[PDB]
Design a protein around this ligand. Structure first.
Ligand code: B65
Ligand code: MG
Ligand code: MG
Length: 284
């Protein structure tokens, strides 16, 4: 095992831990491609967690710098300020694949704002946040999971990304509330006459469930739309992307089964991930 492999293994390790779902799906891709996904995932994870758990903008600048460093000089050795392994893997990926640096930049700009947090007045802002945090990830991943990096492919990957993030938010209401963050908009929170702090105490109700379903409705609709357009992705990527998405979208049924709980992070047992893997691999 060469050292560069060591760095990719560290990226994988990170992905395995923070996302059993995506890890479960993407590891099915051929070597060169999953390596690229591990690295890109690790980068994003460091960004996200350098603020959603280690709330530290200093690091975030360390990472933002390393990347600009790579974009600027893909073929020079750098003494990265944040996490050498991940950057080395990313830099290695970039010397082979096209990378949308601006996309990592939008994510960064985005998780920054998650410092002095302020609710969203409208779903539009909610939706734009889904873009900066996920749509942009779909955009960085596009050159990796596709052959035709065209407007249509970027646009689908992006929507996939935004949809997967809406589901993400649909599961984490409680977790997010404990952390002092509500992502449903006030417009929509008022319209449905619901208070998160109040539901958190006395439990769900129908105001919440309806509201929760309003969003789920959206998420699922966009999910179906992207599945239709799944062929914009490579043949090998298609089933994996589908499993990644169905494995993630299944989370909605899990929030339901647990009665929209605000005190647990529901999940999809690895055995169901296997079941879904099954129902899809037939089709392929
Ligand atoms: O918006 P949130 O609630 O912080 C959400 C993370 C969003 C940022 C993020 C983190 C890690 C990976 C990621 O993008 C991916 C997703 C799949 C594969 C590779 C990268 C996006 S999390 O709930 O999983 O932490
Ligand atoms: Mg987070
Ligand atoms: Mg979340």
């Amino acid at each position: 095992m060469t050292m560069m492999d060591m760095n990719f293994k560290y990226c994988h390790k990170i992905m395995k831990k923070h996302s059993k779902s995506f890890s479960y799906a993407f590891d099915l891709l051929p070597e060169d491609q999953r390596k690229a996904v591990w690295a890109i995932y690790a980068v994003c994870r460091k960004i996200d967690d350098s603020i959603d758990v280690y709330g530290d903008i200093q690091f975030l600048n360390q990472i933002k710098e390393d990347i600009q460093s790579i974009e600027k000089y893909p073929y020079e050795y750098h003494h990265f300020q944040s996490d050498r392994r991940i950057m080395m893997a990313l830099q290695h990926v970039a010397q082979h694949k096209n990378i949308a640096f601006q996309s990592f930049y939008n994510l960064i700009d985005t998780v920054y704002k998650d410092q002095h947090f302020t609710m969203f007045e409208t779903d539009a802002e909610l939706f734009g946040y889904c873009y900066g945090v996920a749509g942009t990830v779909g955009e960085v991943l596009t050159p990796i999971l596709s052959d035709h990096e065209t407007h249509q492919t970027y646009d689908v990957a992006r929507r996939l990304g935004e949809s997967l993030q809406l589901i993400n938010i649909l599961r984490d209401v409680g977790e997010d509330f404990e952390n002092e963050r509500i992502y449903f908009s006030k417009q929509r929170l008022k319209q449905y006459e619901v208070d998160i702090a109040e539901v958190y105490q006395n439990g769900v109700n129908n105001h919440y469930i309806d509201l929760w379903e309003y969003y789920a409705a959206i998420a699922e609709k966009d999910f179906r739309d992207v599945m239709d357009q799944i062929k914009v992705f490579s043949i090998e990527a298609q089933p994996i992307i589908e499993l990644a998405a169905r494995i993630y979208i299944e989370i909605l049924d899990e929030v339901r089964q647990a009665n929209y709980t605000l005190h647990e992070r529901v999940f999809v047992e690895k055995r169901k991930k296997a079941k879904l893997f099954h129902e899809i691999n037939s089709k392929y």
